[PDB]
Design a binder for this molecule. Structure first.
Ligand code: HEM
Ligand code: HEM
Ligand SMILES: *[C@@H]1O[C@H](CO)[C@@H](O[C@@H]2O[C@H](CO)[C@@H](O[C@@H]3O[C@H](CO)[C@@H](O)[C@H](O)[C@@H]3O)[C@H](O)[C@H]2NC(C)=O)[C@H](O)[C@H]1NC(C)=O
Ligand SMILES: *[C@@H]1O[C@H](CO)[C@@H](O[C@@H]2O[C@H](CO)[C@@H](O[C@H]3O[C@H](CO)[C@@H](O)[C@H](O)[C@@H]3O)[C@H](O)[C@H]2NC(C)=O)[C@H](O)[C@H]1NC(C)=O
Ligand SMILES: *[C@@H]1O[C@H](CO)[C@@H](O[C@@H]2O[C@H](CO)[C@@H](O)[C@H](O)[C@H]2NC(C)=O)[C@H](O)[C@H]1NC(C)=O
Ligand SMILES: [Mg+2]
Ligand SMILES: [Mg+2]
Lengths: 236, 236
């Protein structure tokens, strides 16, 4: 145990991402959530989850745009709405109507109740969850943003939790609820529950067919202009 | 001084930006134009031009998206169309109809002929030049992309040449043609011609009103859907 879970203190920076928060809570990233570069993310995601540099370099550099520093962020910076952070999250509220940063059990209810009768979440349950979370945002949020880009990011995130928290073969696109629930609710690797780091590297080619299938099953259409413009920096 | 101009060799990476290419030609950045990080850009831009970290961090991190590396680029990477690189450049051709990378004297005619009768370029001539370059792209390039984002970037780039190549007070928003011409044609600081690095720091608050006036005077309107989506990575 060079990497025990410790609950974050009130001054440790944490963001809207359970993947990065969990790595910080285990000391793979700095426990203070500060001064985190793309090379640090690449190493931490590799050591923690066997996630490879292809997706971590791509996502990491987009995430860097959310801070004012030359080559690092604080995890909380990633909450910046419209860079990566988006409406119809699995476990956070939409920023126009709530808190887009912290885990929120009420929001998480959709995911937690999904795939009724099974002990795993899987590609079809993820797609249904996405459909129902988006419908919620569309019903309740007058400023909802829902575009090809946010839809792809959302499927990427579902594919992330299905593969990183799997019971050992991430190709299957399924993960025990008991692992995924601990991941979201505690931002802890569920080691005592029996989870282990994937022995298969999790790469863009591995994720891509999972992402596409989730989208396909999600009965999705875009909203409004459908323009994939992102926010390129914090307020100037 | 210690930073002499040398022409780039065949293997020295150079991009579509005369600002960075010039820094590399004088060794403020690596002469080979490779392994360049945002902290390197921030330091070279300060040393070479007295351009401050606010604008270099903001633009630098967007530029980092153009490579496949965790935290560096080669200068040539910045040619990636639709991240920063755009149609209706001052000195390059649009990618759909030509070479969007190298200096091009025929394209440069519009700038080189602007502000007739005067010895400087200034805010109104920069605006007229942007107008006419965009008009050329609208005429000749069926694939033209012209959005709020590309217009802002273009005005920023004109504000850059006016300020950085000024006769010593960047607030004036004017620059001797002799200096600006050497800057674009040779990617050389025009030292023997009489230019010296600004003693006034060039910052976002200094540039903003110059950028806005350039746009205001340019008689500009968006094209097509006006969606400011950028390309977030080179080919996956
Ligand atoms: C290391 C592997 C990673 C995993 C397993 C992971 C997992 C996830 C998951 C499951 C979500 C969805 C949370 C929700 O909808 O409630 C998410 C959200 C997010 N992730 Fe990651 N992530 C990882 C890496 C990254 C990286 C490298 C970045 C950027 C530097 C990033 C930035 C975000 C952001 C901004 C969100 C918020 C999107 C939203 O729900 O609005 N993540 N992540
Ligand atoms: C250091 C101060 C800088 C100066 C004085 C400067 C100046 C300029 C100028 C005048 C252009 C217009 C070229 C044309 O229209 O033909 C331009 C283009 C460009 N600059 Fe910079 N620049 C600077 C910094 C940067 C930085 C930090 C980046 C990002 C890493 C960047 C990326 C670009 C790109 C991609 C273009 C091509 C846009 C186009 O014309 O299509 N520049 N630069
Ligand atoms: C994700 O897991 C869910 C739940 O295990 C899978 O959905 C389930 O699929 C089974 C097999 O198709 C369904 O039962 C089959 O059900 C039919 C009639 O409903 C019955 O005639 C067959 O004898 C068999 O029992 C089941 O209804 C269905 N359950 C739910 C909750 O949807 C799903 O296939 C998995 N998805 C993936 C991509 O692995
Ligand atoms: C950018 O430089 C331009 C060229 O120097 C300049 O345009 C010029 O503005 C001058 C000054 O007002 C005008 O000069 C006029 O002065 C007499 C009276 O003293 C008038 O009766 C004449 O109309 C004469 O034009 C010029 O008209 C004009 N020259 C050119 C070639 O356009 C811009 O004002 C400068 N822009 C900025 C923002 O500084
Ligand atoms: C490491 O990150 C920390 C936290 O973001 C940085 O500390 C901040 O620095 C900014 C820049 O001035 C300050 O305005 C904040 O007030 C600081 N925050 C705290 C909590 O002290 C720090 O600069 C970074 N370290 C390095 C070497 O860049
Ligand atoms: Mg969100
Ligand atoms: Mg161009």
């Amino acid at each position: 145990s060079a990497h025990p879970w410790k609950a974050p203190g009130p001054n440790d920076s944490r963001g809207p991402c359970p993947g990065l928060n969990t790595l910080a809570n285990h000391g793979f990233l700095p426990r203070n959530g500060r001064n985190i570069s793309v090379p640090m993310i690449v190493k931490a995601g590799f050591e923690g989850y066997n996630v490879q540099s292809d997706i971590l370099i791509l996502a990491g550099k987009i995430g860097m745009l959310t801070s004012r520093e030359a080559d690092t962020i604080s995890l909380e910076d990633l909450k910046l709405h419209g860079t990566i952070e988006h409406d119809a999250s699995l476990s956070r509220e939409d920023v126009a109507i709530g808190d887009n940063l912290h885990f929120n059990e009420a929001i998480f209810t959709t995911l937690a109740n999904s795939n009724p009768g099974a002990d795993v979440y899987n590609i079809s349950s993820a797609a249904q969850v996405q459909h129902d979370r988006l419908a919620d945002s569309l019903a309740r949020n007058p400023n909802v943003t829902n575009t090809d880009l946010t839809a792809t990011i959302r499927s990427s995130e579902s594919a992330f939790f299905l593969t990183v928290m799997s019971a050992g073969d991430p190709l299957r696109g399924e993960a025990p609820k008991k692992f995924v629930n601990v991941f979201f609710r505690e931002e802890r690797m569920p080691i005592k529950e029996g989870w282990k780091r994937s022995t298969t590297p999790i790469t863009i080619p591995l994720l891509g067919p999972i992402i596409e299938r989730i989208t396909e099953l999600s009965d999705w259409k875009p909203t409004g202009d459908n323009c994939g413009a992102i926010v390129l920096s914090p307020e100037l």
